[PDB]
């Protein structure tokens, strides 16, 4: 409708879309938290245990 | 003199006339951006209740 800027939307697009790129931030790193197997296969011994 | 000056008053009262309605005209598009930015979100109801005075 045109009741406001047209770089006053493109500010907040980039200000939205930087956000979302730091949740994809902090998403990658509290799913780096459980570690996922990188690779399939026969999985040994464990090397460390629960608590350490 | 005196019918000179009164139809030269009338047509500038004209002239007056119509720019006071282009004022109008621009308040209440202003008003109704305004609506519009007030009924999204953006814009608190005291910049609506500037719009309306």
């Known amino acids: 409708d045109q009741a406001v800027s047209k770089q006053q939307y493109a500010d907040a697009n980039a200000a939205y879309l930087q956000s979302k790129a730091a949740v994809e931030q902090a998403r990658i790193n509290l799913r780096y938290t459980k570690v996922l197997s990188p690779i399939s296969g026969r999985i040994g011994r464990s090397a460390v245990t629960e608590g350490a | ?53």
Do not use: C, E, I
């Not at chain 2, 009338?10 to 009924?39: N, V």
């Open chain 2, 1 to 53: 003199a005196s019918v000179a000056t009164a139809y030269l008053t009338l047509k500038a009262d004209q002239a007056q006339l119509q720019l006071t309605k282009d004022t109008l005209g621009t308040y209440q598009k202003s008003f109704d951006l305004t609506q519009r930015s007030y009924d999204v979100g953006v814009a608190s109801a005291l910049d609506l209740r500037q719009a309306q005075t």
